[PDB]
Amino acid sequence: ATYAQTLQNIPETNVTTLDNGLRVASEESSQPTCTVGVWIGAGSRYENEKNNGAGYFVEHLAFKGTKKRPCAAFEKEVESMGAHFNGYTSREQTAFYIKALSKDMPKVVELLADVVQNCALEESQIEKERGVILQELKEMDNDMTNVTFDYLHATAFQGTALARTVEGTTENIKHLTRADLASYIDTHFKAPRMVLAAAGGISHKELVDAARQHFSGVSFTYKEDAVPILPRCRFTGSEIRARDDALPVAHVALAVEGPGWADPDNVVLHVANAIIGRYDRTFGGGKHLSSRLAALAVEHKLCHSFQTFNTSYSDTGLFGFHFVADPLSIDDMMFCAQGEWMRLCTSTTESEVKRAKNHLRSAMVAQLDGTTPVCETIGSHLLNYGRRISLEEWDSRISAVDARMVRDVCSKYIYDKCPALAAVGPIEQLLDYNRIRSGMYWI
Amino acid sequence: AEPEHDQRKRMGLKMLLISALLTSLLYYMKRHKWSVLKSRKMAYRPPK
Ligand SMILES: CCCCCCCCO[C@@H]1O[C@H](CO)[C@@H](O)[C@H](O)[C@H]1O
């Protein structure tokens, strides 16, 4: 049994659209347990200055019970069947999903539909989750890594929809209303923009049947069933420096604008980041790690960790890197990093890519390690690519990447581009955008 | 008294033209780099 075959033999992902526009998809395995959920095309990006944070406030009440079955009951009914209910919300994607035995696949589907369609929004609950969210913000404020990425966006997409935090403003959360929340749900949570995805020991048909049964609400006007295209977000080469010598370490993130979900280059871009990779003081590979940056990081104690990323979006993205270092090793670190980006554009080797690829292949495969992760991949590919891309395909696209190709793309997206940078902490040694800008050319 | 008279003046001409051209250029370049600072904005955000 060869990798090649094990791929072809992976069951297909069934996709059928109901009448109201909702899409039901799923991957059936011989597993007794499963994961089903609805992945929505909503999020902070879809918010505005006045309702920024609603989608998150909503996330906080999605589980506090619906109208048909209030808090106590809703909770009790789920716990008692051993099901796990989780969910999240990003800038361009929200989702609620459940983990339970395939045997309850339908009762689950019912629950889901009841959550997205009939959230309680009990006036009394709101005022409580309001105090709660307010607390979550203070705790998250102490997580430099996310405070940084937020700032990164804040400036990389400054002045636009994407420049907003998923959680939202302090004011916004202090004043949002039963109304605004209701409105958000009734405006965004709609069939054509939703996907009921599932994976495990489920029958597509048993699923799609149970789907037609609880996801009814048919639309009348043409407006109701066309998916609204968002106004574009403008990238801006710029920097934001939140200094505080009182923090023990410094955080730095640098990025150029990304291509966006649909673009094929994204594959090569990922193949690229596979070369630079990532490090963190607990990798035992140490000085022998294959990643040049990681080595230098070790050889010269350049940092505590670092990661490359290719955060994609519908019409844009962020391709860059982030690293945590001590106040006095920020510069060398940055210097070396930008060096590697330059190496990508001008002197990548076949040897490098060959490996990067295998690392990437193993990566995609591991992204589907369980039911939740698979369901999460289905819920996403549809929402973003409009269909499902099977490992069999991914692999072919990845296998086709060669040095000469990695070079061209990276050059196309990195070389001589004005980057967006965010620094937090004791960042005095890292300095001058100008200097950083010139680290954007000549190997 | 000074045979270079004409050549000296012909050079002065060239010197000015180049000079005016080169200066303008380097002014733009100087400004271009500095812009990063000139427009820079800051704020004081204590956890007050
Ligand atoms: C600020 C920089 C100023 C340099 C200006 C260069 C002008 C000198 O150029 C001179 O012009 C003379 C006149 O024809 C020629 O005879 C000389 O050979 C030539 O070198």
Q: Is the CB of B17 under 6 A from ligand 1?
A: no
All structural domains of chain A, each given as residue ranges with its CATH number in brackets, are: 13-226 (3.30.830.10), 238-441 (3.30.830.10)
Beta strands A317-325; A250-258: pairing state: antiparallel
On whether the CB atoms of residues A176 and A54 are closer than 8 A, the answer is yes
On whether the CB atoms of residues A56 and A89 are closer than 8 A, the answer is yes
Ligand 1 atom showing the smallest separation from residue B7 Cα: 13
Distance CA A301, CA A84 (A): 42
3-class secondary-structure state, position A11: coil
Count structural domains, chain B: 1
Element (H, E) at A184: helix A178-188
Tell which B residues from 23 to 42 touch A, by Cβ distance under 8 Å: 33, 36
Phi-psi region of A335 (alpha: psi -120 to 50; beta: other; left: phi over 0): alpha
**Which CATH number goes with the domain that contains B44?**
1.20.5.100
Q: Where are the beta strands (DSSP E) in A224-304?
A: 239-243, 250-258, 278-280
3-class secondary-structure state, position A115: helix
The Å distance, Cα B8 to ligand 1 centre, comes to 9
Of A369, A321, A340, A384, nearest to A31 by C-alpha is A369
Of A380, A404, A426, A420, nearest to A37 by C-alpha is A380
The Å distance, Cα B10 to ligand 1 centre, comes to 8
Which mutation among B8, B9, B10, B14 tests ligand 1's pocket best, with the greatest number of atoms within 8 A of CB?
B14
Q: How was this structure determined?
A: X-ray
On whether the CB atoms of residues A187 and A94 are closer than 8 A, the answer is no
Residue B42's domain spans which residues? 4-48
User: Which resolution, in Å, applies to this structure?
Assistant: 3.2
Q: How many CB pairs under 8 A join A and B?
A: 5
Dig out the tokens for A266 from the structure. 């994204």
Instruction: List, edge to edge, every strand of the sheet that includes A317-325.
Output: A239-243, A420-425, A250-258, A317-325, A305-312, A278-280
Between chains, do A433 and B36 touch, taking CB under 8 Å as contact?
A: yes
Identity (one letter) of the amino acid at A324?
V
CB of B43 within 8 Å of a chain A CB? The answer is no
Distance CA A271, CA A277 (A): 10
Residues of A in CB contact (< 8 Å) with B are 242, 432-434
Residue A59 a catalytic site member? yes
Distance CA A41, CA A94 (A): 6
